[PDB]
Amino acid sequence: MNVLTTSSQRGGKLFKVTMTLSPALSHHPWPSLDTYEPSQNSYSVVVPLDRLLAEMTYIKNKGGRVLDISPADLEALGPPDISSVAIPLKVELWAKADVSDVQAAIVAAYKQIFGNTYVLESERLTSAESLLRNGSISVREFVRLLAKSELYKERFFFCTSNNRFTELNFKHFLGRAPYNQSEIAAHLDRYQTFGYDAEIDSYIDSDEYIQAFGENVVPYYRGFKSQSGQTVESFNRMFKLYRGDAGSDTNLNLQGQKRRVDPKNLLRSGRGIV
Amino acid sequence: MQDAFTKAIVAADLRGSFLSEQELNQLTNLVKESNKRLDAVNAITGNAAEIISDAAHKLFAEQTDLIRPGGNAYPNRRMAACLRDMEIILRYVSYALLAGDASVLEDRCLNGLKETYVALGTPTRSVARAVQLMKETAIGYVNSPSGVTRGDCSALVNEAATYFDKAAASIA
Amino acid sequence: MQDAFTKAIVAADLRGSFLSEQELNQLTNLVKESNKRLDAVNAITGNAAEIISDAAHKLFAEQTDLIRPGGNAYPNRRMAACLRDMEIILRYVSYALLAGDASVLEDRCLNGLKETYVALGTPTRSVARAVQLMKETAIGYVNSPSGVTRGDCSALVNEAATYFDKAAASIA
Amino acid sequence: MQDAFTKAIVAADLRGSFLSEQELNQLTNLVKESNKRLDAVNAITGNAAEIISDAAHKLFAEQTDLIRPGGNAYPNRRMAACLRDMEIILRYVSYALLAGDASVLEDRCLNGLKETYVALGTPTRSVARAVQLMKETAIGYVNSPSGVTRGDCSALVNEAATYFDKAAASIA
Amino acid sequence: MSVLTGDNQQRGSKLFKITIALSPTLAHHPWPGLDTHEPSQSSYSTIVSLERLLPEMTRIKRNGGRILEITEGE
Amino acid sequence: MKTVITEVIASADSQGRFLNNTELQAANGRFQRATASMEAARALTSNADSLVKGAVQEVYNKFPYLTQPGQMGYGDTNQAKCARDISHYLRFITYSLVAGGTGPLDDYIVAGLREVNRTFNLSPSWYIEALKHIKGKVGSQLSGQPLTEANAYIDYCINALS
Amino acid sequence: MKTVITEVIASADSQGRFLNNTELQAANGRFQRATASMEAARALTSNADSLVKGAVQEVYNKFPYLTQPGQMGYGDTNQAKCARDISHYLRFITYSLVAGGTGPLDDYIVAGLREVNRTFNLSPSWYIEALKHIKGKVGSQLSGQPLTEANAYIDYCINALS
Amino acid sequence: MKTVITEVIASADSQGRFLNNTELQAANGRFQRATASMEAARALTSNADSLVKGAVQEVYNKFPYLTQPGQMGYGDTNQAKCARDISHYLRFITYSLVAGGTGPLDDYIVAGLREVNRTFNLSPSWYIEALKHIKGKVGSQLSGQPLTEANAYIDYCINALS
Amino acid sequence: MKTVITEVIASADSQGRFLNNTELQAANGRFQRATASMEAARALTSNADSLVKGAVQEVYNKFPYLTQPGQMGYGDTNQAKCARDISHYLRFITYSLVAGGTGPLDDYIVAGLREVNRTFNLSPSWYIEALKHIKGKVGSQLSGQPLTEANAYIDYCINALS
Numbered sequence A: 001m002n003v004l005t006t007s008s009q010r011g012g013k014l015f016k017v018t019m020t021l022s023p024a025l026s027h028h029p030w031p032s033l034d035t036y037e038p039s040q041n042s043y044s045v046v047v048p049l050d051r052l053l054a055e056m057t058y059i060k061n062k063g064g065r066v067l068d069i070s071p072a073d074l075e076a077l078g079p080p081d082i083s084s085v086a087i088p089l090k091v092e093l094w095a096k097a098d099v100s101d102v103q104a105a106i107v108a109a110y111k112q113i114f115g116n117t118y119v120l121e122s123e124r125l126t127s128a129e130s131l132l133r134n135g136s137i138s139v140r141e142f143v144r145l146l147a148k149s150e151l152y153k154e155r156f157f158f159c160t161s162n163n164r165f166t167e168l169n170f171k172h173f174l175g176r177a178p179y180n181q182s183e184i185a186a187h188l189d190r191y192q193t194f195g196y197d198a199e200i201d202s203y204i205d206s207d208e209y210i211q212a213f214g215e216n217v218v219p220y221y222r223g224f225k226s227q228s229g230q231t232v233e234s235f236n237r238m239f240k241l242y243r244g245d246a247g248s249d250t251n252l253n254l255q256g257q258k259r260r261v262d263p264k265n266l267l268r269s270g271r272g273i274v
Numbered sequence B, C, D: 001m002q003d004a005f006t007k008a009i010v011a012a013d014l015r016g017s018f019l020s021e022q023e024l025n026q027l028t029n030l031v032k033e034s035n036k037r038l039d040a041v042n043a044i045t046g047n048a049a050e051i052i053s054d055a056a057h058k059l060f061a062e063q064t065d066l067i068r069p070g071g072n073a074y075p076n077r078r079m080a081a082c083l084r085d086m087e088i089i090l091r092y093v094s095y096a097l098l099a100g101d102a103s104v105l106e107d108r109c110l111n112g113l114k115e116t117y118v119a120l121g122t123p124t125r126s127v128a129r130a131v132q133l134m135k136e137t138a139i140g141y142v143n144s145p146s147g148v149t150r151g152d153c154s155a156l157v158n159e160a161a162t163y164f165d166k167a168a169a170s171i172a
Numbered sequence E: 001m002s003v004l005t006g007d008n009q010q011r012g013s014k015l016f017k018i019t020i021a022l023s024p025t026l027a028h029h030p031w032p033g034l035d036t037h038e039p040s041q042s043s044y045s046t047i048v049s050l051e052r053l054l055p056e057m058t059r060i061k062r063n064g065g066r067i068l069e070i071t072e073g074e
Numbered sequence F, G, H, I: 001m002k003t004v005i006t007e008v009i010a011s012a013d014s015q016g017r018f019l020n021n022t023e024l025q026a027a028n029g030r031f032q033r034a035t036a037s038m039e040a041a042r043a044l045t046s047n048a049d050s051l052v053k054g055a056v057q058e059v060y061n062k063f064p065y066l067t068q069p070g071q072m073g074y075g076d077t078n079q080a081k082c083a084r085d086i087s088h089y090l091r092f093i094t095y096s097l098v099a100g101g102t103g104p105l106d107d108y109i110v111a112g113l114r115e116v117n118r119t120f121n122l123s124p125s126w127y128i129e130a131l132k133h134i135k136g137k138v139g140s141q142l143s144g145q146p147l148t149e150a151n152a153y154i155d156y157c158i159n160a161l162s
């Protein structure tokens, strides 16, 4: 039932389903009380298209809750290829650029900071780019200037929860997944009492940020490689965070901007207080 | 994040109580052995590079498949990632050792690896072997250092080992 | 960003005109000499590290004050910065050796430089001295390379020089 | 950021020298008086709220124009900003006092502050006065605390004063 | 020019132009060598909104650069 | 939970860095200081009962009206929940003493304090006065660096409430 | 510049917070440890140069081809710049000892080290071997906590170069 | 302004990188291609006059009604501004041919096209039909790779307008 | 993996754009250049055996001391792993030749190079000297644009190691 092979038999579109079952579907044949196996708390099964409506109806009745439906063939092509991003190409900005040096930087900051969503030409931050070109500001400010912009506020903040925002923030600004439940919490409390702007500053003035990017380096991916004071399970979070080269942050998804890192998963790396 | 005191405090609070005279003296003893603890953490910090290097040389001595094409420590990019992970784990083990709590180790970091590396297809037993190699050498250093006062560090050497063993178990 | 063709086009457009037969053939000649140009850019790329290194060795040979305490290429952090922007002048001059127009410098290198190094107290002539040394060595390489067909590259060597000289002038 | 040791080190380095026996003993004395210093910083932290509150009550007692409409500590929003600034300055003065050097105060707080206030229309002379009142009360606390060992803290009281006086001078 | 254009997309209320002597404590070229910076960025003029003024200053001092000036933006 | 140990570890981790002499020196402070801290802790622990009853009463003696009918110092349940609350504060003070930092106070009493007190119509003034009293009596249970420690944390609570 | 004092102040500032008992305990560590640190500093200060000439030579004795003609341990200028460089390291070690942290080493030698050494064809191995030797001799100039301090910082440089 | 040369330079700069064999190979394409491009350019340049009058007329022949009174193909000024506009397009086509990329078209005609045409009640259909006609006649002025180049850019404009 | 083809496609994709004449001109460069590249590739491929043994030896002849006992050019395993490593470089050079860009070199040798070499005590100088030698001999196996290509990539590796 778990992770599948193959698709169809006569022909179908296999969908794999996931639920949470009562002892009504599955119980042991024991002398007392009806219980399902504790590890099949959420169970998944792959069903071809016709049997599918009948299965969902049954599951819902006898008590289960469907958690997901997704085609099997989507889910057979693995996990993302990460070769482009295991070790990236660094893009920095020199004192006295040749101009198109500066052209390189802007295109990359865009891609990285905005998480590969398209920024259309009406959309670009032109006055701010003027500033970088004249020196005036360094490659750090545009990383900070873009983040406080409406375009950044609008595709990533306004329409999703704070859990999601912060998780995106780590990916964009720091290039790495969020290590602890404390990190999520520490941030949510800051936004709540100092506002959005103070909270944005907190990733860009951090010691972690400063070491790796310094001030003239565009933030680049770095979570597919071992880092310091990183729990070990933050390397699996990175797969959940980045979905491949053609994937992007996208707020235009049918289901909306949502999570990607399970809250249960974060707790595995440690729980304390505050 | 927890340390050994913070852990005591959380358990006391869950009773609604001031710390037990039991717990108080357990913590008085941790303060008693704290100079030794500082030397033990210092032993690791002061030889971090060699601990990783020596573990590494030996890992690939044993498992010459990792450095062939097709192998998970080939080409340079992957070897650098593997060397980096060795450092990351040695780092959090040293943090746990300063703290007296695997709350920055077992708690603050040993979970997804098993499934993730099994998914990445990375042989967990070999990864556990790398941690064992670091462990051997790290403890070597904890036990035989530069002009530290002579005494018994076996309690601390054990505790360091359990942090190395947590990591190994969690990953394999 | 402009290149030598784009420059032609902008001037033509400001007249409201299709390119003059004058301008057409000037550009036909640039295409004529383009293999030589590629070798010239390749000469710099293929020896970038040595060009910077050799310029550097010589800069500090001359100006031993920069590497004393109090000096602007001391300590390692600042010496590293010096090596980096020597790389900077070199690469931007090399990218200019391509357009047939200085604007990549007038728009950036020649723009705002009044409130830069001068604001910092960085002696521009010493930066210009490093630039001048990069020029000597870079052109050296443009003129004496590995099994390139024999011919005359003086036009391109001049043009490369003016890019080095633009940078020097702009900075001093 | 500098502290009193770091300052010594920077001056030594600018000579290209190991610290002078002069400078060494000046720093040995700072270590000598460090328990007193910790009590002095603790005196401020332990009464921060009252120091700000009492300074405040007295500032508006003197300058009843600030709390009239038209005044810079009216309405609630502006009073909260003014109370906040009193805290910020008291905070950086305490940091300087732990450090034995004014730099954190000058670099993170005082630099640009006057020009900010003038842009805002905030009366700098009133802000200077609020700082003078914080000084009076803060030192009051440094001099008369809970069961601290009796001795002479006048050297530290002076030094704290100069940090309050730096801020006042910088702002007025 | 960092001669702020307009409100420089800060929105908010007043604009303060703050200049700092930012370090190598912050910034740092992606280069292998020593968390430095490209001479020229010794003083960093920057325009912020009144709501974001306090947070920024706190993280400037916190990361070691020291404010050198402050003027209302207009 | 904020302690000297967790703070230095946090600072190392966030720079991807092994603990160095700076961080180990810091830790030695926390360990050297444990004796005074833990003496304060033991004294506050065994006197807890009376420290709490002393402070509870002092809240009524300083705010006489609280104990009249229709008021929040009247009836068994208010007066019971009061003793409990001061007891919570003393408990976290001892924890902060033992832990080597304000963490226990920050996480269990300070985070959220004002919102809670404001919804439940609890005046900080009472709590400050409970703590001022506890501070008066702890003057003769301790002295030297144990007293300084006790004071540090009592004062920390009073500033949290102002 | 990283010291116990600057670290705790940085951590307070970044949370918009007065120094509290956690931070002052930390500072006491740094002040309590000054005596041992400064004894190490005085001993390393007066017994100084010869350490440089000893290590310089050892680089040539371990890499003989070094002191041969056409090599980088040959001629007055190379051998002069070598002594100077080891002297820089010992200087910053003493500074780090006196300062109470790695700051002086981090800011003046570590930041940029590899880029510089790579451009100038300077092998870290020499410098590690200079430092390993300095570590051998400092075994008999100091003992106890002054030696541990000296060691901490020498080892810190060796790890920076590996 | 987008050309093969500017594109590879932009890509190098943005990775902080010298031009390498990948980028120089690219440039050789642009230089090898110049001959065909520039032949197309010369032919389009000298025939400009008639190519423009041919396409202008064809707009009226395909949209007969445009030339009636009260319409936008009537009177000297409309018909004058039309010839001019097609002339602008042919001009930028020759520029794009000479430049080795779409830059001149992107920067001077494509950026903003629809907003302008929409405010001024200019139908793209006319312009597509002007260009379709120009494409028909350029079939017999050129052949081989010069024709392919001319076509590439004419078609690029037609797609910009659909 | 960086090739002229992947680069232009990447640049199109990132602007949400079909490949246009700019990008196809670029591709023609890469295709026109394949003949010289692939001649270099075939010559480097069949001479691999001797190019590797030539460069390996030259590392020992230039650094004589490496081959003494206790050193890293001694014993079968060091000398075996050396030949292998130079063979890796030549292999990726041929790949970069065939691929039309530095991608194979960037992804399989450059990314991570210094970290690895630094952990394993491998001096770049050896590798530069291996490559300088390979460059000397490739002077008489090739000429014209195949030699220029071979050179481009050998030099690219030497700059990666400086």
Ligand SMILES: CCC1=C(C)/C(=C/C2=NC(=C\c3[nH]c(/C=C4\NC(=O)[C@H](C)[C@H]4CC)c(C)c3CCC(=O)O)/C(CCC(=O)O)=C2C)NC1=O
Pocket: A023, A032, A033, A034, A035, A036, A037, A038
């Ligand atoms: C593999 C061996 C194995 C284990 C360990 C197991 C655990 C298990 N405990 C269950 C229920 C339960 N377990 C408890 C246990 C407790 N309630 C409390 O309040 C206490 C804290 C705790 C007793 C110490 C209760 C009350 C339920 C019933 C929950 C319900 O139906 O509401 C169920 C659901 C099925 C059932 O009710 O029979 C499983 C599978 N099942 C297994 O096959």
Ligand SMILES: CCC1=C(C)/C(=C/C2=NC(=C\c3[nH]c(/C=C4\NC(=O)[C@H](C)[C@H]4CC)c(C)c3CCC(=O)O)/C(CCC(=O)O)=C2C)NC1=O
Pocket: A049, A050, A051, A052, A053, A054, A055, A056, A057, A058, A059, A060, A061, A062
């Ligand atoms: C607990 C009580 C209970 C319910 C409610 C239930 C629903 C249910 N409906 C099902 C199928 C189905 N249900 C329908 C129903 C419909 N098709 C339409 O187009 C209409 C909109 C709608 C009728 C109004 C169809 C067509 C299938 C077969 C789907 C397939 O196999 O392709 C299935 C899959 C198993 C099967 O086909 O027998 C379940 C479990 N099962 C249960 O045990």
Ligand SMILES: CCC1=C(C)/C(=C/C2=NC(=C\c3[nH]c(/C=C4\NC(=O)[C@H](C)[C@H]4CC)c(C)c3CCC(=O)O)/C(CCC(=O)O)=C2C)NC1=O
Pocket: A082, A083, A085, A086, A222, A223, A224, A225, A226, A227, A230, A231, A232, A233, A234, A235, A236, A238, B066, B071, B072, B073, B074, B077, B078, B079, B081, B082, B083, B085, B088, B089, B092, B109, B110, B113, B122, B130
């Ligand atoms: C809690 C302490 C901790 C551990 C243990 C840890 C493991 C870990 N290893 C990772 C990657 C990696 N790990 C390796 C390791 C190897 N490749 C091989 O071929 C060999 C078989 C093996 C070396 C022996 C490689 C190559 C990657 C990068 C995978 C990729 O991005 O394609 C990642 C993804 C994030 C990243 O790349 O930085 C994590 C989280 N992270 C942690 O925080």
Ligand SMILES: CCC1=C(C)/C(=C/C2=NC(=C\c3[nH]c(/C=C4\NC(=O)[C@H](C)[C@H]4CC)c(C)c3CCC(=O)O)/C(CCC(=O)O)=C2C)NC1=O
Pocket: B032, B033, B035, B036, B037, B038, B039, B040, B042, B142, B143, B144, B145, B148, B149, B150, B151, B152, B153, B156, F021, F024, F025, F028, G033, G144, G145, G148
């Ligand atoms: C800068 C941070 C810092 C460190 C590192 C520190 C170390 C330190 N280690 C000490 C003792 C010691 N340290 C050890 C350690 C060991 N004994 C062995 O035989 C093992 C090889 C090793 C096991 C870890 C022992 C046995 C003592 C003496 C007993 C004791 O004081 O507990 C002492 C007490 C003075 C002395 O006896 O020398 C200090 C101050 N103090 C500090 O402030």
Ligand SMILES: CCC1=C(C)/C(=C/C2=NC(=C\c3[nH]c(/C=C4\NC(=O)[C@H](C)[C@H]4CC)c(C)c3CCC(=O)O)/C(CCC(=O)O)=C2C)NC1=O
Pocket: C032, C033, C035, C036, C037, C038, C039, C040, C042, C142, C143, C144, C145, C148, C149, C150, C151, C152, C153, C156, H021, H024, H025, H028, I033, I144, I145, I148
């Ligand atoms: C991969 C990118 C790329 C490069 C680098 C390239 C180079 C290149 N250089 C060439 C010629 C040449 N290159 C030079 C260059 C020089 N002559 C000298 O004496 C000077 C030392 C040096 C000055 C720069 C000369 C003189 C010729 C022959 C004349 C010519 O073709 O213009 C030729 C024509 C074929 C030949 O005669 O060998 C090519 C293809 N082609 C390319 O596609």
Ligand SMILES: CCC1=C(C)/C(=C/C2=NC(=C\c3[nH]c(/C=C4\NC(=O)[C@H](C)[C@H]4CC)c(C)c3CCC(=O)O)/C(CCC(=O)O)=C2C)NC1=O
Pocket: D066, D071, D072, D073, D078, D079, D081, D082, D083, D085, D086, D088, D089, D108, D109, D113, D116, D120, D122, D123, D126, D127, D130, E050, E051, E053, E054, E055, E057, E058, E061
């Ligand atoms: C780096 C640490 C730091 C300092 C010191 C700081 C000062 C500072 N004080 C401000 C405002 C203010 N400051 C005050 C202060 C006063 N009003 C009076 O009448 C009194 C004389 C005085 C109190 C003693 C007032 C009233 C405002 C609000 C002005 C307004 O918006 O009209 C502002 C504008 C942003 C804001 O309102 O939050 C800054 C940046 N900001 C910082 O980040």
Ligand SMILES: CCC1=C(C)/C(=C/C2=NC(=C\c3[nH]c(/C=C4\NC(=O)[C@H](C)[C@H]4CC)c(C)c3CCC(=O)O)/C(CCC(=O)O)=C2C)NC1=O
Pocket: D032, D033, D035, D036, D037, D038, D039, D040, D042, D142, D143, D144, D145, D148, D149, D150, D151, D152, D153, D156, F033, F144, F145, F148, G021, G024, G025, G028, G029
């Ligand atoms: C938790 C951080 C921390 C603090 C706060 C600390 C305080 C501290 N203050 C001390 C002494 C003292 N502290 C003072 C302070 C004062 N004398 C006065 O009359 C003034 C009112 C006040 C001026 C500031 C004096 C006079 C001494 C005794 C002399 C000395 O030890 O220098 C001592 C030495 C032991 C003693 O004599 O009590 C300690 C440990 N130690 C620490 O680790």
Ligand SMILES: CCC1=C(C)/C(=C/C2=NC(=C\c3[nH]c(/C=C4\NC(=O)[C@H](C)[C@H]4CC)c(C)c3CCC(=O)O)/C(CCC(=O)O)=C2C)NC1=O
Pocket: A095, A137, A138, A139, A215, A216, C070, C071, C072, C073, C074, C078, C079, C081, C082, C083, C084, C085, C086, C120, C122, C126, C127, E021, E022, E023, E024, E025, E026, E027, E028, E036, E037, E038, E039, E040, E041, E042, E043, E044
């Ligand atoms: C916004 C991004 C940004 C930039 C660009 C920046 C530049 C900058 N360069 C500085 C110093 C410096 N910059 C250099 C650079 C050079 N010395 C030379 O001789 C060469 C010509 C050149 C290298 C190519 C040096 C030597 C110093 C130190 C000057 C001194 O302290 O004496 C400083 C003073 C603060 C510090 O030393 O850290 C700043 C702010 N800072 C920034 O935050």
Ligand SMILES: CCC1=C(C)/C(=C/C2=NC(=C\c3[nH]c(/C=C4\NC(=O)[C@H](C)[C@H]4CC)c(C)c3CCC(=O)O)/C(CCC(=O)O)=C2C)NC1=O
Pocket: F056, F059, F066, F072, F073, F074, F077, F078, F079, F081, F082, F083, F085, F086, F088, F089, F108, F109, F116, F120, F122, F126, F127, F130
């Ligand atoms: C873990 C740390 C912690 C603290 C500090 C805490 C305070 C606290 N005090 C509460 C209520 C209370 N607190 C008091 C306090 C007092 N009444 C008096 O006689 C005196 C005036 C005063 C004592 C000085 C009273 C009367 C209530 C009942 C309020 C109500 O529900 O109406 C409540 C509401 C929930 C409840 O009714 O218990 C909280 C959460 N809770 C916590 O979890």
Ligand SMILES: CCC1=C(C)/C(=C/C2=NC(=C\c3[nH]c(/C=C4\NC(=O)[C@H](C)[C@H]4CC)c(C)c3CCC(=O)O)/C(CCC(=O)O)=C2C)NC1=O
Pocket: C057, C060, C067, C073, C074, C075, C076, C079, G056, G059, G066, G072, G073, G074, G077, G078, G079, G081, G082, G083, G085, G086, G088, G089, G108, G109, G116, G120, G122, G126, G127, G130
């Ligand atoms: C503030 C801290 C600091 C350090 C550590 C430092 C290192 C340093 N060593 C250098 C050169 C050098 N370093 C050496 C080193 C040696 N030669 C030998 O005989 C031995 C093998 C070895 C000593 C172990 C040599 C020979 C040079 C000259 C390199 C050259 O210019 O060719 C240079 C280049 C500038 C110059 O030529 O002086 C720097 C920056 N600079 C600094 O500012």
Ligand SMILES: CCC1=C(C)/C(=C/C2=NC(=C\c3[nH]c(/C=C4\NC(=O)[C@H](C)[C@H]4CC)c(C)c3CCC(=O)O)/C(CCC(=O)O)=C2C)NC1=O
Pocket: H056, H059, H066, H072, H073, H074, H077, H078, H079, H081, H082, H083, H085, H086, H088, H089, H108, H109, H116, H120, H122, H126, H127, H130
């Ligand atoms: C640099 C590139 C560039 C282009 C392409 C361009 C198009 C353009 N066409 C315009 C007007 C016009 N365009 C036309 C076009 C036509 N009338 C006819 O007889 C035909 C149906 C058709 C030709 C196929 C007409 C009639 C106007 C006048 C519209 C008005 O102002 O009412 C205008 C308005 C400003 C003006 O009145 O001149 C612009 C900007 N402008 C530019 O700067």
Ligand SMILES: CCC1=C(C)/C(=C/C2=NC(=C\c3[nH]c(/C=C4\NC(=O)[C@H](C)[C@H]4CC)c(C)c3CCC(=O)O)/C(CCC(=O)O)=C2C)NC1=O
Pocket: B057, B060, B067, B073, B074, B075, B076, B079, I056, I059, I066, I072, I073, I074, I077, I078, I079, I081, I082, I083, I085, I086, I088, I089, I108, I109, I116, I120, I122, I126, I127, I130
């Ligand atoms: C895919 C591209 C790729 C490269 C380039 C590569 C280099 C490389 N060389 C290595 C070791 C080595 N490299 C050498 C090199 C040499 N010994 C000598 O006799 C000469 C001095 C020199 C040749 C010039 C030596 C001796 C070792 C063994 C180091 C050790 O484990 O101690 C290792 C460590 C793993 C192992 O022991 O095999 C790597 C990863 N690995 C790769 O995957």
